[PDB]
Amino acid sequence: IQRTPKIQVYSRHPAENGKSNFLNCYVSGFHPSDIEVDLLKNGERIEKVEHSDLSFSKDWSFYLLYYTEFTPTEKDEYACRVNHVTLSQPKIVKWDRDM
Amino acid sequence: SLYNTVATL
Amino acid sequence: GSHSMRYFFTSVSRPGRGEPRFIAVGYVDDTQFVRFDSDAASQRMEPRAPWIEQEGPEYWDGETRKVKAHSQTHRVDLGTLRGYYNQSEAGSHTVQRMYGCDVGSDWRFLRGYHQYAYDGKDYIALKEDLRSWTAADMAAQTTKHKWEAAHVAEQLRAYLEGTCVEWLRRYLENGKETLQRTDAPKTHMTHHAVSDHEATLRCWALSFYPAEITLTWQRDGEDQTQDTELVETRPAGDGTFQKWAAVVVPSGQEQRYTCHVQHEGLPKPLTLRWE
């Protein structure tokens, strides 16, 4: 079976412009486990991004956390881009400090 | 601590 | 006050070349303490929590040997399952396994488990009595017969009620500082106008541990689910979790709404209301 990924983009700590933080992209509820997740800064791919060890939920659906340090500002737009077999095209979820 | 053995299907 | 230890195993076949990708992770409650990734350089079970580092070389050599034995078992299983399902060798498939034990507040055996899945669906699972199997289909049926003849359940039961519980207790003791501590959620509320007539109230629960938690909205003292949104609990990245619940309300009427937070780290539930 195949399951489309759920995606939440958020910061580890409450956001404050100019203050160092961590940008997270939690992808979950998907199957198979092969997936492409990238964090973006102003539409550009961020390098050195890390992620947790693949694990899964009671219903066997996989979940992973991708993260990197970052500094929110008034201008820069951050986002997560996810590609999976279940998606007709890469899904881009923009970071919103209010969520 | 993991289970010592694992039988195949 | 209850606890558990769990191991998750994933193997994904790679028909184009080589062996299956194999990833194993170990957890005590919601804390990962070990991991193995066939893609890693070490080719060793590795620590993921400080309190497991206390373990000596014999522990790391043993866990490594067993986790490698697990990967090989999954390797064989993918082949066997491919046959059972009369599937092409061209496609990539997935096998997953999870097992563990739970103990109550007195740290006594409460229940054990051992489940298996193929391509994201239940394949076979050990019954709660730890004496019988639950096979999802006929492929699993033949596996079930094979395991009954080899008495796999008897062996698993001893592990689940013996070594599993015994080591969980050891871990809980060695990592008492974090494992036996609860982090109550830090809560607050944010206001987000959606129009000149409506506004969103968002109730936040942050930096809590364990992950289990309940957020509920009440309007004039009674639960409200309409016009609310609850996101799934998510990891902060530092070992704790986060979650928020939101409700859209008519502007000016915010004081009618209350957010209720229930968590093992709270003597009594917390209640939040917009200023």
Tab-separated table of C-alpha atoms in Angstrom:
chain	number	residue	atom	x	y	z
A	1	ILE	CA	0.000	0.000	0.000
A	2	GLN	CA	0.983	3.616	-0.478
A	3	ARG	CA	0.207	6.567	1.766
A	4	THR	CA	0.727	10.229	0.976
A	5	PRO	CA	2.910	12.138	3.453
A	6	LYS	CA	1.602	14.660	5.956
A	7	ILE	CA	3.854	17.704	6.394
A	8	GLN	CA	4.340	20.291	9.150
A	9	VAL	CA	7.028	22.961	8.910
A	10	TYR	CA	7.924	24.740	12.173
A	11	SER	CA	10.665	26.006	14.459
A	12	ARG	CA	11.990	24.239	17.538
A	13	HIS	CA	11.666	27.394	19.624
A	14	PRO	CA	9.297	30.373	19.375
A	15	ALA	CA	10.473	32.516	16.503
A	16	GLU	CA	12.224	35.860	16.872
A	17	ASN	CA	13.875	37.676	14.017
A	18	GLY	CA	17.626	37.713	14.343
A	19	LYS	CA	17.678	34.946	16.936
A	20	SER	CA	19.243	31.592	16.006
A	21	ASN	CA	16.806	28.655	15.956
A	22	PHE	CA	16.101	25.323	14.202
A	23	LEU	CA	13.838	24.864	11.160
A	24	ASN	CA	11.934	21.570	11.206
A	25	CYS	CA	10.037	19.637	8.579
A	26	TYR	CA	8.223	16.692	10.083
A	27	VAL	CA	6.972	14.297	7.391
A	28	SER	CA	4.754	11.460	8.540
A	29	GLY	CA	1.960	9.058	7.621
A	30	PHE	CA	3.729	7.977	4.418
A	31	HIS	CA	4.473	4.680	2.650
A	32	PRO	CA	6.844	3.506	1.164
A	33	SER	CA	9.677	5.030	3.162
A	34	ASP	CA	11.585	6.417	0.168
A	35	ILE	CA	11.078	10.151	0.171
A	36	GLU	CA	12.771	13.379	-0.840
A	37	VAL	CA	12.651	16.250	1.643
A	38	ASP	CA	14.486	19.541	1.243
A	39	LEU	CA	14.441	22.704	3.337
A	40	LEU	CA	14.416	25.890	1.291
A	41	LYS	CA	15.603	29.422	1.978
A	42	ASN	CA	14.088	31.852	-0.519
A	43	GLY	CA	13.326	29.059	-2.968
A	44	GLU	CA	16.890	27.753	-2.733
A	45	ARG	CA	17.900	24.394	-1.308
A	46	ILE	CA	19.635	24.531	2.084
A	47	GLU	CA	22.709	22.330	2.511
A	48	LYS	CA	23.902	20.181	5.399
A	49	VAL	CA	20.325	19.329	6.370
A	50	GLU	CA	20.042	16.414	8.796
A	51	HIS	CA	17.208	14.018	9.648
A	52	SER	CA	16.245	11.496	12.321
A	53	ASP	CA	16.424	7.717	11.944
A	54	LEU	CA	13.467	6.280	10.045
A	55	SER	CA	10.789	5.021	12.378
A	56	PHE	CA	7.100	4.316	12.075
A	57	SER	CA	3.711	4.448	13.757
A	58	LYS	CA	1.281	1.756	14.916
A	59	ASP	CA	-0.325	1.679	11.455
A	60	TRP	CA	3.154	1.073	9.938
A	61	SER	CA	3.230	4.557	8.359
A	62	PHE	CA	6.719	6.138	8.436
A	63	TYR	CA	7.796	9.415	9.968
A	64	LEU	CA	10.945	11.485	9.745
A	65	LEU	CA	12.152	14.822	11.031
A	66	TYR	CA	14.446	16.954	8.842
A	67	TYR	CA	16.106	19.966	10.512
A	68	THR	CA	18.787	22.608	10.342
A	69	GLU	CA	19.769	25.679	12.296
A	70	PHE	CA	18.459	28.919	10.819
A	71	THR	CA	17.682	32.519	11.807
A	72	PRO	CA	14.244	33.853	11.018
A	73	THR	CA	14.104	37.379	9.640
A	74	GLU	CA	11.494	39.782	8.327
A	75	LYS	CA	12.337	39.030	4.691
A	76	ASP	CA	13.706	35.510	4.118
A	77	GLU	CA	11.079	32.913	3.318
A	78	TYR	CA	11.644	29.400	4.557
A	79	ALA	CA	9.941	26.248	3.370
A	80	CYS	CA	9.967	22.491	3.040
A	81	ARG	CA	9.768	20.648	-0.309
A	82	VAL	CA	8.678	17.032	-0.273
A	83	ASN	CA	8.582	14.546	-3.152
A	84	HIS	CA	7.144	11.051	-2.820
A	85	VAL	CA	5.764	8.390	-5.214
A	86	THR	CA	2.223	9.370	-4.168
A	87	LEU	CA	2.653	12.972	-5.245
A	88	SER	CA	2.128	14.063	-8.848
A	89	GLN	CA	4.702	16.755	-8.180
A	90	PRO	CA	6.881	18.072	-5.322
A	91	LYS	CA	4.862	19.558	-2.502
A	92	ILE	CA	6.127	22.820	-1.017
A	93	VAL	CA	4.918	23.899	2.418
A	94	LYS	CA	5.977	27.389	3.524
A	95	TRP	CA	7.121	28.020	7.088
A	96	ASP	CA	4.649	30.186	9.074
A	97	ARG	CA	5.971	31.306	12.488
A	98	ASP	CA	2.374	31.250	13.713
A	99	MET	CA	2.093	27.476	13.276
B	1	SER	CA	18.544	-5.203	24.672
B	2	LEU	CA	17.438	-6.897	21.447
B	3	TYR	CA	15.934	-10.369	21.120
B	4	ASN	CA	18.742	-12.907	20.637
B	5	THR	CA	17.239	-14.783	17.659
B	6	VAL	CA	14.829	-14.046	14.781
B	7	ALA	CA	13.011	-16.781	12.828
B	8	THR	CA	12.260	-16.149	9.173
B	9	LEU	CA	8.812	-16.097	7.583
C	1	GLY	CA	4.209	5.858	35.783
C	2	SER	CA	4.044	3.019	33.296
C	3	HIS	CA	6.914	2.426	30.828
C	4	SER	CA	7.924	0.516	27.749
C	5	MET	CA	10.780	-0.502	25.515
C	6	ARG	CA	10.392	-0.828	21.777
C	7	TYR	CA	12.408	-1.766	18.736
C	8	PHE	CA	11.433	-0.825	15.178
C	9	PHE	CA	12.964	-2.498	12.143
C	10	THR	CA	12.628	-1.491	8.529
C	11	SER	CA	14.129	-3.232	5.484
C	12	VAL	CA	13.516	-2.067	1.926
C	13	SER	CA	14.622	-4.241	-0.992
C	14	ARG	CA	16.852	-2.809	-3.710
C	15	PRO	CA	16.353	-5.009	-6.834
C	16	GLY	CA	18.550	-2.786	-8.972
C	17	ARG	CA	21.647	-3.632	-6.900
C	18	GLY	CA	22.886	-4.798	-3.529
C	19	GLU	CA	21.136	-5.702	-0.317
C	20	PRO	CA	18.078	-4.132	1.367
C	21	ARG	CA	18.380	-0.821	3.175
C	22	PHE	CA	18.107	-1.775	6.870
C	23	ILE	CA	17.263	0.612	9.705
C	24	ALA	CA	16.723	-0.291	13.339
C	25	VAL	CA	15.912	2.077	16.209
C	26	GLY	CA	15.390	1.374	19.899
C	27	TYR	CA	13.139	3.321	22.292
C	28	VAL	CA	12.419	3.532	26.016
C	29	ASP	CA	9.063	5.330	26.267
C	30	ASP	CA	9.556	8.212	23.810
C	31	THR	CA	13.357	8.276	23.985
C	32	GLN	CA	15.386	6.688	21.216
C	33	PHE	CA	18.502	5.175	22.808
C	34	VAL	CA	20.052	3.059	20.006
C	35	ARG	CA	20.111	2.769	16.243
C	36	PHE	CA	21.617	0.817	13.365
C	37	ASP	CA	21.624	1.921	9.738
C	38	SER	CA	23.079	-0.478	7.145
C	39	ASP	CA	24.028	2.664	5.246
C	40	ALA	CA	26.187	3.947	8.142
C	41	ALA	CA	29.962	3.586	8.203
C	42	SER	CA	30.291	2.040	11.636
C	43	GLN	CA	28.227	-1.076	10.854
C	44	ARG	CA	27.604	-1.113	14.600
C	45	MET	CA	24.631	-0.603	16.870
C	46	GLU	CA	25.212	3.004	18.038
C	47	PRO	CA	24.089	4.935	21.162
C	48	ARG	CA	21.532	7.715	20.830
C	49	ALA	CA	21.166	8.618	24.511
C	50	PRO	CA	23.864	9.364	27.136
C	51	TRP	CA	22.680	6.806	29.689
C	52	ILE	CA	23.193	3.906	27.265
C	53	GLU	CA	26.849	4.914	26.716
C	54	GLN	CA	27.581	3.551	30.174
C	55	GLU	CA	27.222	0.078	28.613
C	56	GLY	CA	30.479	-1.751	28.069
C	57	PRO	CA	31.980	-3.292	24.873
C	58	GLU	CA	30.344	-6.659	25.414
C	59	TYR	CA	26.974	-4.931	25.247
C	60	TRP	CA	27.837	-3.076	22.034
C	61	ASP	CA	29.410	-6.183	20.466
C	62	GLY	CA	26.328	-8.256	21.344
C	63	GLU	CA	23.720	-5.752	20.198
C	64	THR	CA	25.635	-5.320	16.983
C	65	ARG	CA	25.753	-9.063	16.324
C	66	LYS	CA	22.015	-9.438	16.992
C	67	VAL	CA	20.945	-6.391	14.989
C	68	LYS	CA	22.974	-7.732	12.042
C	69	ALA	CA	21.271	-11.116	12.446
C	70	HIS	CA	17.950	-9.226	12.294
C	71	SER	CA	18.886	-7.476	9.040
C	72	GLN	CA	19.766	-10.818	7.478
C	73	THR	CA	16.455	-12.314	8.594
C	74	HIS	CA	14.629	-9.440	6.912
C	75	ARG	CA	16.763	-9.995	3.833
C	76	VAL	CA	15.601	-13.610	3.626
C	77	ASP	CA	12.005	-12.602	4.433
C	78	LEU	CA	11.825	-10.173	1.530
C	79	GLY	CA	12.788	-13.043	-0.773
C	80	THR	CA	10.376	-15.479	0.824
C	81	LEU	CA	7.537	-12.956	0.798
C	82	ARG	CA	8.242	-12.081	-2.810
C	83	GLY	CA	7.636	-15.746	-3.517
C	84	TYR	CA	4.542	-16.096	-1.350
C	85	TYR	CA	2.959	-13.158	-3.146
C	86	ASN	CA	4.178	-14.362	-6.539
C	87	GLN	CA	5.739	-10.942	-7.136
C	88	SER	CA	8.332	-9.768	-9.663
C	89	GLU	CA	11.949	-9.383	-8.581
C	90	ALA	CA	11.848	-6.010	-10.351
C	91	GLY	CA	9.986	-4.105	-7.660
C	92	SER	CA	11.192	-2.800	-4.320
C	93	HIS	CA	9.308	-4.068	-1.264
C	94	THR	CA	9.228	-3.326	2.459
C	95	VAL	CA	9.188	-5.437	5.578
C	96	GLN	CA	8.701	-3.952	9.035
C	97	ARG	CA	8.903	-5.466	12.507
C	98	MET	CA	8.186	-4.050	15.941
C	99	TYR	CA	8.329	-5.635	19.321
C	100	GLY	CA	8.583	-4.591	22.924
C	101	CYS	CA	7.280	-4.865	26.468
C	102	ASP	CA	5.337	-2.606	28.825
C	103	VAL	CA	5.541	-2.393	32.583
C	104	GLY	CA	3.252	-0.648	35.042
C	105	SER	CA	4.162	1.705	37.871
C	106	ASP	CA	5.573	-1.180	39.891
C	107	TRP	CA	7.782	-2.001	36.918
C	108	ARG	CA	6.142	-5.423	36.594
C	109	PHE	CA	5.365	-7.100	33.266
C	110	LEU	CA	2.160	-5.702	31.818
C	111	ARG	CA	2.120	-6.808	28.190
C	112	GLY	CA	4.354	-7.726	25.311
C	113	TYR	CA	4.117	-7.484	21.566
C	114	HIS	CA	5.686	-8.529	18.285
C	115	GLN	CA	4.175	-7.427	14.968
C	116	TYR	CA	5.221	-7.712	11.336
C	117	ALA	CA	4.139	-6.001	8.128
C	118	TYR	CA	4.760	-6.342	4.417
C	119	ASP	CA	4.444	-3.320	2.131
C	120	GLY	CA	2.780	-1.305	4.896
C	121	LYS	CA	0.043	-3.779	5.795
C	122	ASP	CA	-0.279	-6.197	8.697
C	123	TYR	CA	1.270	-9.545	7.907
C	124	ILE	CA	1.459	-11.475	11.180
C	125	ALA	CA	1.354	-10.445	14.842
C	126	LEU	CA	1.698	-12.134	18.214
C	127	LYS	CA	-1.588	-12.195	20.169
C	128	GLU	CA	-1.682	-10.399	23.525
C	129	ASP	CA	-1.750	-13.767	25.294
C	130	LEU	CA	1.653	-14.282	23.652
C	131	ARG	CA	0.557	-17.801	22.818
C	132	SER	CA	-1.033	-17.368	19.415
C	133	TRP	CA	-0.650	-15.614	16.096
C	134	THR	CA	-2.836	-13.312	14.015
C	135	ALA	CA	-2.200	-13.923	10.287
C	136	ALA	CA	-3.754	-11.354	7.922
C	137	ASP	CA	-3.905	-13.565	4.823
C	138	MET	CA	-2.849	-16.930	3.439
C	139	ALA	CA	0.786	-15.981	2.928
C	140	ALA	CA	0.902	-15.082	6.626
C	141	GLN	CA	-0.980	-18.328	7.278
C	142	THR	CA	1.877	-20.449	5.983
C	143	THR	CA	4.245	-18.306	8.064
C	144	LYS	CA	1.960	-18.916	11.049
C	145	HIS	CA	2.136	-22.682	10.547
C	146	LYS	CA	5.894	-22.545	10.179
C	147	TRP	CA	6.245	-20.564	13.409
C	148	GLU	CA	3.925	-22.850	15.367
C	149	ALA	CA	6.040	-25.860	14.407
C	150	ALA	CA	9.238	-24.041	15.438
C	151	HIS	CA	7.593	-22.711	18.609
C	152	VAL	CA	8.584	-19.124	17.877
C	153	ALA	CA	5.930	-17.782	20.269
C	154	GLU	CA	7.310	-19.718	23.235
C	155	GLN	CA	10.748	-18.168	22.617
C	156	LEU	CA	9.388	-14.651	22.133
C	157	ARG	CA	7.292	-14.921	25.247
C	158	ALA	CA	10.369	-15.656	27.355
C	159	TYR	CA	12.147	-12.608	25.909
C	160	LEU	CA	9.133	-10.300	26.319
C	161	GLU	CA	8.516	-11.350	29.926
C	162	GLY	CA	12.172	-11.878	30.805
C	163	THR	CA	15.097	-10.060	29.207
C	164	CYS	CA	12.847	-7.324	27.793
C	165	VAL	CA	11.436	-6.325	31.134
C	166	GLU	CA	14.728	-6.877	32.958
C	167	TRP	CA	16.673	-4.554	30.695
C	168	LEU	CA	13.899	-1.968	30.555
C	169	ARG	CA	14.204	-1.739	34.328
C	170	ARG	CA	17.991	-1.398	34.031
C	171	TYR	CA	17.702	1.389	31.469
C	172	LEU	CA	15.075	3.262	33.476
C	173	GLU	CA	17.460	3.126	36.402
C	174	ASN	CA	20.598	4.167	34.524
C	175	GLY	CA	18.769	6.986	32.750
C	176	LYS	CA	16.564	7.885	35.717
C	177	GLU	CA	17.399	11.574	35.376
C	178	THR	CA	15.444	11.878	32.132
C	179	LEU	CA	13.560	8.619	31.743
C	180	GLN	CA	11.816	8.845	35.096
C	181	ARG	CA	11.157	12.564	34.776
C	182	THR	CA	8.152	14.156	33.106
C	183	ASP	CA	8.357	17.551	31.393
C	184	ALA	CA	5.032	19.372	31.769
C	185	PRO	CA	4.019	21.321	28.695
C	186	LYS	CA	4.774	25.033	28.579
C	187	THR	CA	1.495	26.559	27.436
C	188	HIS	CA	0.279	29.927	26.100
C	189	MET	CA	-2.299	31.251	23.612
C	190	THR	CA	-1.955	33.306	20.421
C	191	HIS	CA	-4.569	35.424	18.647
C	192	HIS	CA	-4.793	35.546	14.861
C	193	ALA	CA	-7.515	37.601	13.211
C	194	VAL	CA	-8.853	35.935	10.058
C	195	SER	CA	-11.208	38.752	9.099
C	196	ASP	CA	-12.683	41.819	10.776
C	197	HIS	CA	-15.370	39.555	12.183
C	198	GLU	CA	-13.493	36.375	13.071
C	199	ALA	CA	-10.335	35.446	14.871
C	200	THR	CA	-8.341	32.282	15.411
C	201	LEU	CA	-7.313	31.344	18.933
C	202	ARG	CA	-4.341	28.917	18.996
C	203	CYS	CA	-3.485	27.018	22.186
C	204	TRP	CA	0.148	25.878	22.347
C	205	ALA	CA	1.733	23.063	24.364
C	206	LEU	CA	5.508	23.033	24.116
C	207	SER	CA	8.609	21.235	25.253
C	208	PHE	CA	6.711	18.387	26.921
C	209	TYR	CA	7.643	14.748	27.591
C	210	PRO	CA	6.329	12.142	27.108
C	211	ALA	CA	4.471	12.796	23.818
C	212	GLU	CA	1.069	11.645	25.076
C	213	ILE	CA	-1.135	14.727	25.658
C	214	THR	CA	-4.716	15.970	25.260
C	215	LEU	CA	-5.777	19.471	24.130
C	216	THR	CA	-9.504	20.264	24.194
C	217	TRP	CA	-11.498	23.415	23.490
C	218	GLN	CA	-14.549	24.390	25.534
C	219	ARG	CA	-17.021	27.175	24.820
C	220	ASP	CA	-18.973	28.414	27.831
C	221	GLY	CA	-18.032	25.252	29.714
C	222	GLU	CA	-18.744	22.652	27.087
C	223	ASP	CA	-16.508	20.825	24.625
C	224	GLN	CA	-16.382	22.233	21.116
C	225	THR	CA	-15.011	20.431	18.057
C	226	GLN	CA	-16.591	22.454	15.303
C	227	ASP	CA	-14.376	25.109	13.789
C	228	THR	CA	-11.322	23.664	15.564
C	229	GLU	CA	-8.045	22.232	14.254
C	230	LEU	CA	-5.630	19.908	16.105
C	231	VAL	CA	-2.274	19.151	14.541
C	232	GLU	CA	-0.544	15.874	15.232
C	233	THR	CA	1.999	15.829	18.066
C	234	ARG	CA	5.396	16.592	16.598
C	235	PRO	CA	9.000	16.433	17.857
C	236	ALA	CA	10.773	19.693	18.723
C	237	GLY	CA	14.115	18.083	17.890
C	238	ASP	CA	15.605	18.233	21.401
C	239	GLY	CA	13.824	15.207	22.877
C	240	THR	CA	10.557	16.990	23.682
C	241	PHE	CA	7.318	17.431	21.780
C	242	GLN	CA	4.910	20.140	20.689
C	243	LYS	CA	1.252	20.448	19.802
C	244	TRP	CA	-1.394	23.103	19.303
C	245	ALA	CA	-5.170	23.280	19.038
C	246	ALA	CA	-7.035	26.129	17.355
C	247	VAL	CA	-10.572	27.457	17.154
C	248	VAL	CA	-12.132	30.196	15.033
C	249	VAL	CA	-14.403	32.461	17.035
C	250	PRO	CA	-16.309	35.726	16.510
C	251	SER	CA	-14.023	38.626	17.369
C	252	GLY	CA	-14.835	40.095	20.759
C	253	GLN	CA	-16.087	36.726	22.076
C	254	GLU	CA	-12.646	35.219	22.903
C	255	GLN	CA	-13.309	35.117	26.650
C	256	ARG	CA	-15.982	32.431	26.162
C	257	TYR	CA	-13.366	29.943	25.035
C	258	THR	CA	-11.039	27.840	27.141
C	259	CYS	CA	-8.286	25.451	26.204
C	260	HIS	CA	-7.789	22.419	28.414
C	261	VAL	CA	-4.417	20.699	28.627
C	262	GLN	CA	-4.028	17.246	30.107
C	263	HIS	CA	-0.602	15.696	30.540
C	264	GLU	CA	1.065	13.167	32.819
C	265	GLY	CA	3.367	15.950	33.969
C	266	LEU	CA	0.476	18.016	35.328
C	267	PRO	CA	-1.043	17.228	38.783
C	268	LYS	CA	-4.297	18.594	37.425
C	269	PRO	CA	-5.167	19.783	33.934
C	270	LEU	CA	-4.380	23.353	32.940
C	271	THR	CA	-6.988	25.802	31.625
C	272	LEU	CA	-6.116	28.742	29.351
C	273	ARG	CA	-8.345	31.663	28.305
C	274	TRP	CA	-7.486	34.647	26.095
C	275	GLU	CA	-6.794	37.867	28.063
